[PDB]
C-alpha cells in the first residue's frame, strides 16, 4: 500500500537464516535495521506518539521533549517530523558532531547539557523543561512508556510468528527498555499459545536481570554494548515472561558483529553481535538441536563507523 | 519467509506518500534504503551475481573483481560475504576511511589505487587483474550487464504496480547506471502495459541525456549529486522508454534532502533529493495533477554524513 506518513511504515522485517552460527541453520535473525530510521526504535517511536495523540496527551501544538540521543532520540525525531511536531533532545555538549548533525538533519532542537554531567544532565534539563509548561511538552518515557512493549506484541511478535508458520521455538533478544523481548513473548506466548524459550540478553559487565533473578546484589558497570545493558530493570522488562538470560561480553559482541558484517553479509550493528552470539551459545547445546531460534538484531552497521566496531578493522 | 542467505531478502521497499511536496498527496516516494546493504543497488548486486551463477561465468572459488566503493560496491560486498565469494574492490587511495572501513568490514580486499589516477586508475587496475587471470577473476559491470535493469523489471517494477493497485502514472529516477528507470519503465509499460511518464532525472552540471536527445555536444561536469550523472549514456539505460528528462542543480537536490529529513521524517540521501525535486516540478504542473507520481529515492542519509549533505546543518 502507500503509507500517509513514515511513521505508518514501521517494521514487516526480514528474517535471514545464518550459514555461519548455529548447527544447522537453527539459527535465524530478524533485521530490525530495515526500518524508517533503521533500527527496531522506529516501532516504539511511531507508537508511543500514536499512543499518546489517541490519549490525548499529545495535541497539535504540543512539543516533544526527551532525553536521548541514540536510536529512540532518531525514532522520535522521524516520527515527530512525519506527523508535524517540534521535538527538543537534551543529551550532553559532549556527544559526536555526526549524530548532532543526524538529528539537526531531522529538524531537531538540541539543549546541550553540561558534559560533567553525563545522561542525569540530560534527563534533568528535559525533565526542567517539562516542568517550564507542563501544558506544552510531553517526555513520552521510553523504559516506562507501556506503549514500547505494545506495538513489541502487535508486530514485531505477529511478524515472527507469521515468518516462521509459527515455528519459532526460542527468541534471543538484547535487554534494553524490555519492549522488544516482552511484547515478542507476550505475542507468541499468549496470543499464538506457544510455550517458547524467551532469552533475555545483557552485558557480562553490567548483569543486573541475571544479579536480580539470584537474588544477589545488584552491581552495573560499564560496557561497550552500545543499546543494552541501562544498569537496571526496566518497568518495560516483564521478568515474568523471560526464561533465560544469558550474559555476553563486549569484546565477543564486536567480534560477532564483524563475523556477522564478514561472514554473514549482514550489517549489524553491536547490540546484533551481542544477541548472535548468545544465541550461537544456545544453538550449540544439544537441548536446542531442534529448535528454531529467532535472534533480534536491532540496528546497522553504520551507525556504527566511529565505534569500535570498526576502529581497527 | 526465512531468507537463505541476505541476497533473497532485497526489495519489497515501501511508498510514502508526501505531505509537503506535490499538490494534494500525487508524490509518493519508494524507499531504497531499505534494503539489505541499504541502497537501490542490493537488487543489483544480488542479480549480477545469481546470473553469473546461472550463467556459469561465477563458480566456486572464482573470485569478484570490481572498481567501486559506492553503492555497488557495497552491495556486491555484502552478497559476496552471504554467498561466500572473495571479493576485491579497487578504488583510489584517497577514498575516506569511513568508506574503507566500511568495506573492510564486509570483508573486501581493498586495492588502493593511485590517487592521481582518480576512478580511472581503479578501473585500470581491476580491468588488469583480471587481465592477469581471466579463469580466476569475474568482474560484473553494472553499466552493462543486462542482470541490472532485469532485477528492476521483475522486482522494483512490480512491487510499484502492486502497492498502487494499476494507478501509478508517473516514474522519477536519478539515471547512474539507467537499470532502474529502464527496469521498472519496462516492467510498467510492457509486462502490465500501461502508458505512464518516464522521467529521467540527471544534474543540470552534466546534462548528458538531455544533451543526447536533443542532439547537442555532449558536455558532462562536475556536480554533488552522487549516484547520478555519470557523464555519458550508459548501456543500461534504454532511451526508448524515456518519455522525459528533468534536471535538478546538486544546491537543490542537498535542500531537498534535508527538507525530506526535517519535514517528512524521510532519512534520504542526495540523489532522493534530487529526485524528488524533479517529481516536485512536474506535481506542480496542472497536467499532473490528478496523476499518481512516484519517485525512486535510492538510498538513505547516514551513509552521507561527511558529505554536503550535512556540512553546515
Not at 146 to 170: F, L, M, S, Y
Not at 220 to 247: C, M, W, Y
Request: proline content about 4%.
Amino acid at each position: 500500500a502507500i503509507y500517509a506518513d513514515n511513521s505508518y511504515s514501521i517494521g514487516n522485517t526480514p528474517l535471514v537464516r545464518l550459514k555461519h552460527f548455529g548447527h544447522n541453520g537453527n539459527v535465524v535473525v530478524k533485521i530490525e535495521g530495515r526500518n524508517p530510521s533503521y533500527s527496531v526504535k522506529c516501532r516504539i517511536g511511531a507508537n508511543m506518539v500514536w499512543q499518546a495523540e489517541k490519549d490525548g496527551t499529545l495535541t497539535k501544538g504540543k512539543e516533544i521533549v526527551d532525553a536521548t540521543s541514540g536510536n529512540t532520540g532518531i525514532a522520535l525525531a522521524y516520527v515527530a517530523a512525519a506527523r508535524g511536531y517540534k521535538i527538543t533532545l537534551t543529551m550532553p555538549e559532549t556527544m559526536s558532531l555526526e549524530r548532532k548533525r543526524l538529528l539537526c538533519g531531522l529538524g531537531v532542537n538540541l539543549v546541550l547539557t553540561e558534559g560533567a554531567k553525563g545522561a542525569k544532565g540530560a534527563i534533568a534539563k528535559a525533565e526542567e523543561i517539562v516542568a517550564s509548561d507542563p501544558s506544552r511538552y510531553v517526555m513520552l518515557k521510553q523504559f516506562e512508556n507501556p506503549a514500547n512493549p505494545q506495538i513489541h506484541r502487535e508486530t514485531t511478535g505477529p511478524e515472527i510468528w507469521k515468518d516462521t508458520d509459527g515455528k519459532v521455538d526460542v527468541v534471543v533478544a538484547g535487554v534494553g527498555t524490555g519492549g522488544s523481548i516482552t511484547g515478542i513473548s507476550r505475542a507468541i506466548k499468549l496470543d499464538f499459545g506457544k510455550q517458547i524459550t524467551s532469552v533475555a540478553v545483557e552485558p557480562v559487565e553490567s548483569p543486573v536481570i541475571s544479579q536480580t533473578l539470584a537474588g544477589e546484589e545488584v552491581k552495573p558497570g560499564p560496557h561497550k554494548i552500545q543499546g543494552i545493558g541501562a544498569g537496571f530493570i526496566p518497568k518495560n522488562l516483564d521478568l515474568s515472561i523471560i526464561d533465560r538470560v544469558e550474559t555476553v561480553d563486549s569484546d565477543t559482541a564486536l567480534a560477532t558483529a564483524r563475523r556477522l558484517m564478514a561472514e554473514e553479509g549482514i550489517l549489524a550493528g553491536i547490540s546484533s553481535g551481542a544477541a548472535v552470539a548468545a544465541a550461537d551459545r544456545l544453538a550449540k547445546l544439544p537441548e536446542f538441536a531442534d529448535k528454531l531460534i529467532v535472534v533480534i538484531l536491532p540496528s546497522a552497521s553504520e551507525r556504527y563507523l566511529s565505534t569500535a566496531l570498526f576502529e581497527g578493522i
